[PDB]
Amino acid sequence: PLEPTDQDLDVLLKNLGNLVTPMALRVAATLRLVDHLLADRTDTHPQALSRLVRHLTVVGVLEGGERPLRPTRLGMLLADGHPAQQRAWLDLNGAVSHADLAFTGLLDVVRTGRPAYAGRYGRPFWEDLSADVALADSFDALMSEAPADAYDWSAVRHVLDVGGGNGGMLAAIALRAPHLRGTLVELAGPAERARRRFADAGLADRVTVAEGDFFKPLPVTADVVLLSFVLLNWSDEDALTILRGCVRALEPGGRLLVLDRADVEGDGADRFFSTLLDLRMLTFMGGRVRTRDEVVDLAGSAGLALASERTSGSTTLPFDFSILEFTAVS
């Protein structure tokens, strides 16, 4: 029988089992401490704050105090202008950090498969973003060349982006390739941001917004259909019906492009971030991160076969994702 050491127990207490520090880092981010210093210009109880700072000091985020109180190298990651933007990710008014707090309901989540977001905040995730302007804006800012660059658009005329958000990706494919038409299918909130972006990019003549619900049949056909970070939001049955709607909308010889996290045997991709994203999707909305093989198999059920596979990444965070091109079977 295996026997824990002093170092195992130290890792459990300080890292793997530690819920205090992650909360302390979120509070610190939500007071721009690594900026505000460059801490009581903050509406904070004076005693409470130094108690927090003492903890932030011990875990390698600050130094100094009663020589001078300055962030460490690590501490700089909560610097507003750092290109990892971890300060905004951790900010408690932001939509992700806000969602993260629902992890305290993880017990029920695992008992039942059901999301926790509603239990903590009233509305399920997407409904909450559209009724609350501030969470929509912050989520938007956090999720802002992969497809436009990875793909030969010369043999394509019409791209239908399903659940394509504020239109950023469709705008860019269209700006890169002047000959293309595009159509975006989205809920109201992101649809309206799409209209504004298309109009200001001078694309309204060839790139349109069709507000709607991707569980209902898609309004148009197209020779390329895009599902970019959509499937992971949904359960198998729900992702199956989105896929099936996508197949119907596919012109002859048309291609479905799935942009998502899709791990492969010897990928080299950090499984930590795969499981983390996975538990987030489970907890926030009952979705799931799927591997390459699982996506392929769900696509097969919807009448689609894999034609090609490629990778992209991130100029910011350690996150490899894939683009999986599918054709109709019959």
Ligand X SMILES: CC[C@@]1(O)C[C@H](O[C@H]2C[C@H](N(C)C)[C@H](O[C@@H]3C[C@H](O)[C@@H](O[C@H]4CCC(=O)[C@@H](C)O4)[C@H](C)O3)[C@H](C)O2)c2c(cc3c(c2O)C(=O)c2c(O)cccc2C3=O)C1O
Ligand Y SMILES: C[S@@+](CC[C@H](N)C(=O)[O-])C[C@H]1O[C@@H](n2cnc3c(N)ncnc32)[C@H](O)[C@@H]1O
Contact residues for ligand Y (CB under 6 A)?
126, 143, 163-165, 169, 185-187, 190, 213-215, 228-230, 233
Burial pattern 156-172, b for ≥16 Cβ within 10 A else e, equals bebbbbbbbbbbbbbbb
Q: Which two tokens stand for residue 108?
A: 């029920």
Q: Which two tokens stand for residue 233?
A: 């939001």
With tokens 């489970």, the residue in question is: 282
Q: Which of 141, 276, 307, 329 binds its own copies (CB under 8 A)?
A: 276
Residues 6+ apart with CB under 8 A from 196: none
Residue 31 binds: one of ligand Y, ligand X, its own copies, none (C-beta under 5 to 8 A by kind): its own copies
Residue 203 binds: one of ligand Y, ligand X, its own copies, none (C-beta under 5 to 8 A by kind): none
Q: CB 33 → ligand Y: shortest distance, Å?
A: 28
Burial pattern 41-52, b for ≥16 Cβ within 10 A else e, equals eeeeeeeebbeb
Q: Which of 68, 107, 237, 252 binds its own copies (CB under 8 A)?
A: 107
> What gap in Å lies between CA 71 and CA 28, rounded to an integer?
11
200 marked ligand binding residue:
no
314 marked ligand binding residue:
no
Q: CB 272 → ligand X: shortest distance, Å?
A: 9
Tell me how far CA of residue 115 lies from CA of 99, 127, 152, 200, 273, in angstroms: 11, 14, 39, 37, 19
From the list 42-50, 146-154, 179-187, 242-250, the region that binds ligand X by CB under 6 A is 146-154
Residue 214 binds: one of ligand Y, its own copies, ligand X, none (C-beta under 5 to 8 A by kind): ligand Y
Q: CB 77 → ligand Y: shortest distance, Å?
A: 22
User: Taking CB under 8 A as the rule, which mask of x and - marks residues 112-151 in contact with its own copies?
Assistant: xx--------------------------------------
Residue 88 sits in the site that holds ligand X (CB under 6 A): no
Q: Which of 277, 279, 298, 328 binds ligand X (CB under 6 A)?
A: 277
197 in Cβ contact with 174 (< 8 Å): no
Residue 188 sits in the site that holds its own copies (CB under 8 A): no
Q: Which of 62, 77, 99, 258 binds ligand X (CB under 6 A)?
A: 99
Q: What count of residues does the chain have?
A: 330
Task: Count the Cβ atoms, other than its own, within 10 Å of residue 78.
Answer: 27
